[PDB]
Design a protein around this ligand. Structure first.
Ligand SMILES: *[C@@H]1O[C@H](CO)[C@@H](O[C@@H]2O[C@H](CO)[C@@H](O)[C@H](O)[C@H]2NC(C)=O)[C@H](O)[C@H]1NC(C)=O
Ligand SMILES: [Cl-]
Ligand SMILES: [Cl-]
Ligand SMILES: [Cl-]
Lengths: 213, 195, 215, 221, 230
């Protein structure tokens, strides 16, 4: 099959700047058959460009498509706030495939996360499960690493996390991570630690509590 | 509700080789020819036995759309009474033709760096095509006396040749997409009318 | 010019003449038609032949065109004084370079109305007044020739010189013979440094040469 | 103008089928095919297939061949996508789109793409039954507090602080799907350290599918 | 009634541009194209390009590499030829002409067909001066070895514009043996001509010879004595 690879995964730019988005095909794609789509948050995709370089009905001039063979480009000449979104390329030369998408996000200054750890509530412990929560508040950029440590033993496979969409006011991200243990396993250990790696910090930051203190 | 699919013919990603020219039949639909005629896309819209500005007022039993790629200087051969490799060996219109020949420069689609060579024409044939004849045969052409017996050699030629569409070609050697509309009047109810 | 024609042809009234037009594989040899134009002095070209052999309504059957291989021919039978004109062949050249309308260089047709007359040639050196102004013009005056077709070559010593040469088209004198002039522009240094300069006039296979030297 | 309007959200058990409708208006229906694309939560676009509105010819992605049926009703200019033998990983927003990649009449490749996409139809496939959430406190210059909205199905829940009077410093996170098949969500607010034990903080949870409303006062200890 | 009428003569400096018009009447302008053909003085026809009148599609000679723009105004049935960065070898009569080809609809490919209707032409001369009086130099009497007893003498009338210049000899007293030659148009876009008179060699000691050059366009009159030199 024809695989479309988009780069970069994330473009970090300011309003008024030029965005260059890349779509590379694993084999030759007829320029007639390469399209670009925009998806704003909570909305259906929108056709921008068809036939590699033709802009769809109602699409502004600042969007232009170019390239041929296996190397295609979407250019946004002067980013408006409305242009911060995910962009997908699409080929129908052979069957139909989409690229993995490129996110265009608002660039701002590096901001370290404010880190908080929450023990499970007594109310939850009654029910026989322990949820330990770690909050990374208002950081930039999005790339962050949470490591859970229980009596300094590195945890794996027993946590889940999610990240907020870029804040409309301060352009930061926030992340929540839950470590889930049985009540039995939770009550075997003392030190619950959330270790955070982020480019806003000079070394990893650890927030912790002692069970029952 | 039931629009003739001229869009599908004019907006196809690939066109046929002229030697294997593609025919589509259009029937039982409303045709908007003004949108075609007034299109900025076309550099040729030449008609025979019908005025193109009258097409939206006319009914036909069928419309045939023949489509293919040739080079710019061969568009003149797509007309009644013409001679040359394309008229003689590839695509022939009759003297009594009722239709329109529509062509546009396709250099942006059918040419690429290091040249595009996907489009074929018949270079050799023993006799001229009849009107609307299609020859897709690939038999070795005997230009001499010694039997070819199915093999290229001295005076024994493969009959098809590829166009060389490099982007930097002169306009006469650039690819042109051609649609030939035949307006058919049978002793039968008309099915394809203008708005 | 992409097509080649003879610079001039002559015939007596009533006679037949032919004007050749040679092209190449990319124009006449590629199956493109040849058209012919007739140009009277001081007038736009007039279409004489179209599609190799066809005459417009006003053109008499005395004019016939032919095309074969990479060449074409205009035949004029029963020459009349009114046929005296420049004749241009025209075709179409299709190549990877481009698609262009192409012309022959033109043929001057003379219908012989008087005996052939050799040119009288006078060559003047630069004036001392012009040399003072730091300029030098050799003036070659050519008169009383018929037919009205000449070529002019200039020589520095015995060597040809094409640089700084300006030559007029022949034009009819009162006596219906022809006049022309050729000017060679030099620096005073060029003029003074050479042994001599010559003006050579070729007419009907004959040559008249005149030579001047720094005195 | 051109509008594709899709049917409302669906919640299905594994092994069941779902039929999504796509009502087209504002253009000649039989001149354009319909293309179908799905998007799993937080993932990319996946092509499902194509139908001609003219002759009912269909082309499906190999992954869905023998499981998917696309149809059109010409009189109501509506396209349908039926996906059968559903599994949890069929959970996605399903989009219809007006197609100009393959011709409705002649079935040949076209210079175009998918335009005038529908608003999408969310289909959730799960063994889980409808269950209201358990709300647990997340007990605290700057201090953080929150509530954990745990073990509910299906999405969504709404969270507010002090009945929506507190928005400053609030983050409600996307829910995660636990191996149990139930969702878990955190909502946090950052407040002045000194405001702890002097200011009342109540998180208001609504889960409409289970008709569950919980107000949890979050205290320090 | 079928005719093409072109705009008037132009004189332009090197590096400047010119825009020639060509107005059609007596026929449906948009049913044909226009081809442009130029002719340097005393030289052959040279095609520049064509425009198809309906869509305004153009094809230009490779030689005029992006210096030429052809347009039409449908509402005035007028074709335009703009030539930029003018140089000396652009000096020519510029013709518009109609390839004799019509069809129902339109067609770009009009180069194959004989041109039946021609405009009257437009003279374009590339010159640094649009009016200049002549510099007159004497051509000292010269006798050939063959005809020693006869001498040719004259005046070189150099670098004037436009035409015409008039030359008389001894204020009209001398007419026999006088030959004023047609002017050359130099690559500079200035004219030069010569006037010669043939006289007896025995007269050169006694008879005064003055050429009277009048250039009315510049209101310039020059009398030049032509003396024997040794
Ligand atoms: C071929 O496709 C093009 C591109 O979609 C069609 O062009 C549109 O044409 C309509 C009607 O003339 C215009 O109102 C729009 O502005 C055009 N859209 C764009 C994006 O250019 C064209 O109609 C199609 N050809 C045919 C014959 O149907
Ligand atoms: Cl021809
Ligand atoms: Cl597939
Ligand atoms: Cl004498």
């Amino acid at each position: 099959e024809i695989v479309l690879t988009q780069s970069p995964g994330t473009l970090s730019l300011s309003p008024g700047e030029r965005a260059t988005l890349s779509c590379r095909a694993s084999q030759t794609v007829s320029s007639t058959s390469l399209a670009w789509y925009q998806q704003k948050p909570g909305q259906a995709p929108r056709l921008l460009i068809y036939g590699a370089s033709s802009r769809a009905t109602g699409i502004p001039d600042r969007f232009s498509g170019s390239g041929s063979g296996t190397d295609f480009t979407l250019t946004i000449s002067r980013l408006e706030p409305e242009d911060f979104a995910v962009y997908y390329c699409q080929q129908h030369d052979t069957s139909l495939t989409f690229g993995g998408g490129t996110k265009v996000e608002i660039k701002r200054t590096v901001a370290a996360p404010s880190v908080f750890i929450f023990p499970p509530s007594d109310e939850q412990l009654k029910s026989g499960t322990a949820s330990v929560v770690c909050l990374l508040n208002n950081f930039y950029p999005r790339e962050a690493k949470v490591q859970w440590k229980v009596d300094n033993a590195l945890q794996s496979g027993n946590s889940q996390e999610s990240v907020t969409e870029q804040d409309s006011k301060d352009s930061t991200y926030s992340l929540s991570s839950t470590l889930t243990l049985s009540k039995a396993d939770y009550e075997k250990h003392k030190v619950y630690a959330c270790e955070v790696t982020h480019q806003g910090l000079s070394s990893p930051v650890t927030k912790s509590f002692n069970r029952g203190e | 509700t039931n629009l003739c699919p001229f869009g599908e013919v004019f907006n196809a990603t690939r066109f046929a080789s002229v030697y294997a020219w593609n025919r589509k039949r259009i029937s039982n639909c409303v045709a908007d020819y003004s949108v075609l005629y007034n299109s900025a896309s076309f550099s040729t819209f030449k008609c025979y036995g019908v005025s193109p500005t009258k097409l939206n007022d006319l009914c036909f039993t069928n419309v045939y759309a023949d489509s293919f790629v040739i080079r710019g200087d061969e568009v003149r051969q797509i007309a009644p009474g013409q001679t040359g490799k394309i008229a003689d060996y590839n695509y022939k219109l009759p003297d009594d033709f009722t239709g329109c020949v529509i062509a546009w420069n396709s250099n942006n689609l059918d040419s690429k760096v290091g040249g595009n060579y996907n489009y074929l024409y018949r270079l050799f044939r023993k006799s001229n095509l009849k009107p609307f004849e299609r020859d897709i045969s690939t038999e070795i052409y005997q230009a001499g006396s010694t039997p070819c017996n199915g093999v290229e050699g001295f005076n024994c030629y493969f009959p098809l040749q590829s166009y060389g569409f490099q982007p930097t070609n002169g306009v006469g050697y650039q690819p042109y997409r051609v649609v030939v509309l035949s307006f058919e009047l049978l002793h039968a109810p008309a099915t394809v009318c203008g708005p | 010019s992409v097509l080649t024609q003879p610079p001039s042809v002559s015939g007596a009234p009533g006679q037949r003449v032919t004007i050749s037009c040679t092209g190449s594989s990319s124009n006449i040899g590629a199956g493109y038609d040849v058209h012919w134009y007739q140009q009277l002095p001081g007038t736009a070209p007039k279409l004489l032949i179209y599609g190799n052999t066809n005459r417009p309504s006003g053109v008499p059957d005395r004019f016939s065109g032919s095309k074969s291989g990479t060449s074409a021919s205009l035949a004029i039978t029963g020459l009349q004084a009114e046929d005296e004109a420049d004749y241009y062949c025209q075709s179409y050249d299709s190549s990877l370079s481009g698609s262009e309308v192409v012309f022959g260089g033109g043929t001057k047709l003379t219908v012989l109305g008087q005996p052939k007359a050799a040119p009288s040639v006078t060559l003047f050196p630069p004036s001392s007044e012009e040399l003072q102004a730091n300029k030098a013009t050799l003036v070659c005056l050519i008169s009383d020739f018929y037919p009205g077709a000449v070529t002019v070559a200039w020589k520095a010593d015995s060597s040809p010189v094409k640089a700084g040469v300006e030559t007029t088209t022949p034009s009819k004198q009162s006596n219906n013979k022809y006049a022309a002039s050729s000017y060679l522009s030099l620096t005073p240094e060029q003029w003074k440094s050479h042994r001599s300069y010559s003006c050579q006039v070729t007419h009907e296979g004959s040559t008249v040469e005149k030579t001047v030297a720094p005195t | 103008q051109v509008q594709l309007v899709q049917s409302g959200a669906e919640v299905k058990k594994p092994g069941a089928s779902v039929k999504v409708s796509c009502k087209a208006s504002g253009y000649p229906f039989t001149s354009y095919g319909i293309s179908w694309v799905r998007q799993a939560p937080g993932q990319g676009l996946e092509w499902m297939g194509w139908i001609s509105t003219y002759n009912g010819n269909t082309n499906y992605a190999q992954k869905f061949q023998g499981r998917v049926t696309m149809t059109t009703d010409t009189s109501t200019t509506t396209g349908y996508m039926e996906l059968r033998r559903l599994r949890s990983d069929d959970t996605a927003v399903y989009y219809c789109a007006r197609d100009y990649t393959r011709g409705a009449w002649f079935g040949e490749s076209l210079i175009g793409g998918f335009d005038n996409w529908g608003q999408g139809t969310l289909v959730t496939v799960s063994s889980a039954s409808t269950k209201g959430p358990s709300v647990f406190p997340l007990a605290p210059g700057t201090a953080a507090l929150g509530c954990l909205v745990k073990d509910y199905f299906p999405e969504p829940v709404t969270v507010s602080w002090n009945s929506g009077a507190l928005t400053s410093g609030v983050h409600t996170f996307p829910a995660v799907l636990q191996s149990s098949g139930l969702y878990s969500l955190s909502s946090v607010v950052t407040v002045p350290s000194s405001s702890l034990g002097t200011q009342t903080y109540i998180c208001n949870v609504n889960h409409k599918p289970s008709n569950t409303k919980v107000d949890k006062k979050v205290e320090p200890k």
